[PDB]
Structure 1
């Protein structure tokens, strides 16, 4: 049971990181951010491509993890393990909030609970980069 992606797409509110004031935050889906030959010398791979976001929006941790797996499976099949190095350059430091409602419930007197994590990106910000 997860809310539609359109609920938490727009960048709203002050940044709300996980700290001593924000407790009970679920672990983000994505844990590995550098994939491929992370130890390859700077001269082996001269090429460079980027994914540049053209929108100011929230990117959930699930979307980054799905993209990380998608590139991993496709790139391993094509260029092999030791022929590419992809680094994800957006981290889920912003924590979303959900106000779950159970009619015996309070109507509007409540402040949301932690729901997930997302990366507040902006226009022209590099999301994922890779060298081959």
Structure 2
């Protein structure tokens, strides 16, 4: 039985990653950071729905999996597996310790958490404009696996790109837009 998340919710220490100094750190519980059609293109899924953190806290890697194993569930239950793409924009890079205030008290690594901030995006699921209301409900359920307070906002940008939903058309049709991968870059003069 692991120690509860009540013990590690607050950013009380400096960031303590895996380096050439701390070398017994376990494998974090989240391994897949993208669910859905990650092979897909930019103009496949226009809309973007975020899960933004309203707290300065540490989310454990055990909660990043629990929020992602369950957001995948309600999507394939109430849609297909080929309409969404939920990127998890938090990575467990800070390593927690356990003393398993006494002589020789500096702990050993047992778990890894994500030091998240105010306004830092936690989840991001780009979907189609048809199947939007199934995505507000998959992300309402996924933030229950999260500590702290989160909001589910509607992003004004076209998917995972840095270009607006107002100003995406006549920018691929003006030809000025470099679509590489899952993101875009406005071509400028060199």
* TM bracket, shorter-chain basis: over 0.9
Give me the TM-score of the superposition, normalised by structure 1: 0.92
Q: What is the rounded CA distance, in whole Å, between the counterparts of 2:104 and 2:46 in structure 1?
A: 57
List alignment gaps of at least 5 residues for structure 2. 128-190
* Alignment coverage as a number of residue pairs: 127
Partner of 1:83: helix, strand, or coil? coil
The yes-or-no answer on 1:127 pairing with 2:122 is yes
Q: What residue is the counterpart of 2:4 in the other structure? A: 4
The yes-or-no answer on 1:94 pairing with 2:94 is yes
The yes-or-no answer on 1:38 pairing with 2:38 is yes
Q: What residue is the counterpart of 1:103 in the other structure? A: none
TM superposition outliers: structure 1 runs of 4+ over 4 Å: none
Partner of 2:87: helix, strand, or coil? strand
Map residues 60-99 of structure 1 onto 2, 5 A cutoff. Answer: 60-99=60-99
Partner of 1:52: helix, strand, or coil? strand
Give me the TM-score of the superposition, normalised by structure 2: 0.65
List alignment gaps of at least 5 residues for structure 1. 101-105
Q: For residues 69-94 of structure 1, give each alpha carbon's deviation from its aligned partner in whole angstroms, at most 9, with x where no partner exists.
A: 00011111122111111100001011
Q: What is the rounded CA distance, in whole Å, between the counterparts of 1:19 and 1:76 in structure 2?
A: 39
Which protein, 1 or 2, shows the higher relative CO under an 8 Å CA cutoff with sep ≥ 6?
A: 1
Cα RMSD between the aligned structures? 1.2
Out of 12-21 and 57-66, give the one that drifted further.
Answer: 12-21
Q: What is the rounded CA distance, in whole Å, between the counterparts of 1:107 and 1:88 in structure 2?
A: 39
Q: What is the rounded CA distance, in whole Å, between the counterparts of 1:86 and 1:117 in structure 2?
A: 22
Q: What residue is the counterpart of 2:135 in the other structure? A: none
Deviation at 1:110, TM superposition (A): 1.9
